[PDB]
Amino acid sequence: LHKLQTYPRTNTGSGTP
Amino acid sequence: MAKIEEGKLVIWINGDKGYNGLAEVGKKFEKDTGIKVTVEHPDKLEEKFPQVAATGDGPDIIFWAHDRFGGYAQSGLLAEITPDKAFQDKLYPFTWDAVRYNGKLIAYPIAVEALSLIYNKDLLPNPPKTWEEIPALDKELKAKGKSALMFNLQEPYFTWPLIAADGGYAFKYENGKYDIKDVGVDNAGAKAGLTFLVDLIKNKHMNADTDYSIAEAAFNKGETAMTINGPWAWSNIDTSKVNYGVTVLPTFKGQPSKPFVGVLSAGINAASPNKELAKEFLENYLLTDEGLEAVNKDKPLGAVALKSYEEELAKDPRIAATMENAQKGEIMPNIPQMSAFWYAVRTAVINAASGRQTVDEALKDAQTNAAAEFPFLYVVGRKKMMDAQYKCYDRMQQLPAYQGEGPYCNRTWDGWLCWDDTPAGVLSYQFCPDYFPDFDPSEKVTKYCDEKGVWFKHPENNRTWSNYTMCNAF
Numbered sequence: 001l002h003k004l005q006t007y008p009r010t011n012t013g014s015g016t017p
Numbered sequence: 018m019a020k021i022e023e024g025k026l027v028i029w030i031n032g033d034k035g036y037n038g039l040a041e042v043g044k045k046f047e048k049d050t051g052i053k054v055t056v057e058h059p060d061k062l063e064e065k066f067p068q069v070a071a072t073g074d075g076p077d078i079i080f081w082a083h084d085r086f087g088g089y090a091q092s093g094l095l096a097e098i099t100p101d102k103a104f105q106d107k108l109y110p111f112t113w114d115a116v117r118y119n120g121k122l123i124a125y126p127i128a129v130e131a132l133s134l135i136y137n138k139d140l141l142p143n144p145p146k147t148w149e150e151i152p153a154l155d156k157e158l159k160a161k162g163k164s165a166l167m168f169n170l171q172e173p174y175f176t177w178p179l180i181a182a183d184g185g186y187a188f189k190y191e192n193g194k195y196d197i198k199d200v201g202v203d204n205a206g207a208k209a210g211l212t213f214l215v216d217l218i219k220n221k222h223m224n225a226d227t228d229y230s231i232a233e234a235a236f237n238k239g240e241t242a243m244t245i246n247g248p249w250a251w252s253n254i255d256t257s258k259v260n261y262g263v264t265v266l267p268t269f270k271g272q273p274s275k276p277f278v279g280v281l282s283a284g285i286n287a288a289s290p291n292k293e294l295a296k297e298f299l300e301n302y303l304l305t306d307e308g309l310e311a312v313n314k315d316k317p318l319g320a321v322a323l324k325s326y327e328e329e330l331a332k333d334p335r336i337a338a339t340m341e342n343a344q345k346g347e348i349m350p351n352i353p354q355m356s357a358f359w360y361a362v363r364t365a366v367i368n369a370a371s372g373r374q375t376v377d378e379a380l381k382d383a384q385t386n387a388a389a390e391f392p393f394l395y396v397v398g399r400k401k402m403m404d405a406q407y408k409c410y411d412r413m414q415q416l417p418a419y420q421g422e423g424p425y426c427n428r429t430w431d432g433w434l435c436w437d438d439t440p441a442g443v444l445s446y447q448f449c450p451d452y453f454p455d456f457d458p459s460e461k462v463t464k465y466c467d468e469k470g471v472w473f474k475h476p477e478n479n480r481t482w483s484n485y486t487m488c489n490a491f
């Protein structure tokens with residue numbers, strides 16, 4: 001498990017920029 | 018609380034450091050430049066900073082040990098610092114490494130902080146080399162109305178050296194990166210160290226409730242023969258006239274106590290309108306022999322990052338001891354999960370010491386109590402995005418019309434990033450933005466200009482869509 005993987009996941013799908 | 022304001026500096030630093038000495042460096046700066054420097058020491062400043070910086074407020078400069086700074090940088094809250102190599106060469110390379118995060122320097126190192134054993138030479142002319150001898154020493158001292166040892170049991174910084182001695186660690190480092198799946202208290206060594214602490218308490222050689230104030234008062238009044246503390250404590254001991262020494266921490270199972278070493282560092286708030294002033298102050302006033310001396314005269318920094326002044330300080334045996342304990346310890350990781358680690362260990366130690374949990378139960382819950390802290394590291398602020406938006410829409414007005422030949426996609430703000438006019442068929446790219454802490458700013462965002470001078474639309478909703486998926490993949 002790497003340091004960015006613990007964070008809540010920011011949406012990057014459709015309906016984002 | 019003094020407010021952020023162009024043409025002045027506001028500095029936060031912990032109330033156990035020489036904040037009045039730092040303010041004197043500020044007065045020298047103001048004398049030369051006309052720029053006022055205000056130094057404050059709010060409680061829990063290391064917890065407060067991200068939330069106030071997230072809305073564009075907070076101090077221009079924040080001082081803390083480097084272990085907090087990765088969390089702040091991952092949230093986009095710290096300015097990159099950019100000292101020249103000549104300046105970098107004035108500080109020890111290990112101190113710069115403590116403040117290097119995702120490839121960037123994110124603070125200026127100031128002091129190298131390690132705990133030492135502090136002892137009353139009149140009660141105890143030959144301090145114990147081992148933790149294991151302390152119970153018998155306490156028995157001997159209690160017959161004289163004294164005790165062997167009192168130190169802060171409420172903050173895990175102070176108990177950590179014993180826990181780490183025979184195998185405790187925060188996170189495994191391997192293949193160039195930390196593995197955060199386990200906190201390193203799930204080993205026999207960590208358990209043995211915490212068990213030794215708990216046993217001291219069960220056997221009445223220490224009291225679970227002892228904190229920084231209680232321990233300090235007892236040592237400085239000559240009631241206890243030893244304490245464990247850092248160099249910031251030395252001023253008050255000088256005032257008390259106890260005849261004290263500063264020495265290597267005791268060993269445990271033959272292994273050195275292994276303090277977690279902090280590099281007291283100064284970060285620049287990403288939101289500051291005074292970044293250049295802050296750089297000038299830190300490089301050219303504070304990080305000089307005269308600047309550090311002014312702070313040191315208020316409360317000792319201990320060992321420092323600046324080579325020229327450290328070489329002078331290390332003539333003092335107390336400083337040589339601080340460095341010996343530092344070299345027998347471990348530099349803290351700077352990763353965002355360090356705060357989670359500390360919160361978990363805090364609870365485990367208080368719970369085990371007090372008998373609220375067994376040692377085994379307390380260390381088991383440290384794993385899940387650490388993980389419980391992870392979502393709270395998601396602190397974000399809108400300022401960078403909004404500055405980038407404003408810049409984008411301005412630049413789209415001012416740039417001359419496209420002078421290439423053929424169909425192309427128009428200049429546009431996609432919501433997070435700015436794009437120029439792009440030829441048909443080109444996959445444009447730029448670095449991922451640092452708005453969200455699950456984003457890696459060394460990864461790339463792509464935006465496809467299709468065959469007709471039309472930007473790519475996501476097929477799920479047929480809306481123009483830049484591709485941020487590599488920013489937080491895996």
Ligand SMILES: OC[C@H]1O[C@H](O[C@H]2[C@H](O)[C@@H](O)[C@@H](O)O[C@@H]2CO)[C@H](O)[C@@H](O)[C@@H]1O
Nearest residue numbers: 031033082084085172173174175279359
């Ligand atoms: O107890 C956990 C706490 O430990 C360290 O804080 C130290 C700090 O480094 C020193 O400068 C001194 O002020 O005492 C503090 C302990 O009270 C970590 O730096 C900190 O993040 C952590 O929460």
Ligand SMILES: *[C@@H]1O[C@H](CO)[C@@H](O)[C@H](O)[C@H]1NC(C)=O
Nearest residue numbers: 418419425426427428470471
């Ligand atoms: C692209 O920009 C040009 C010049 O600003 C404008 O005339 C044209 O209508 C725009 N096209 C689209 C598809 O928005």
Ligand SMILES: *[C@@H]1O[C@H](CO)[C@@H](O)[C@H](O)[C@H]1NC(C)=O
Nearest residue numbers: 463465475476484485486487
């Ligand atoms: C976004 O980029 C990733 C990485 O190149 C790629 O796997 C994915 O197919 C792209 N998505 C779209 C819809 O373009």
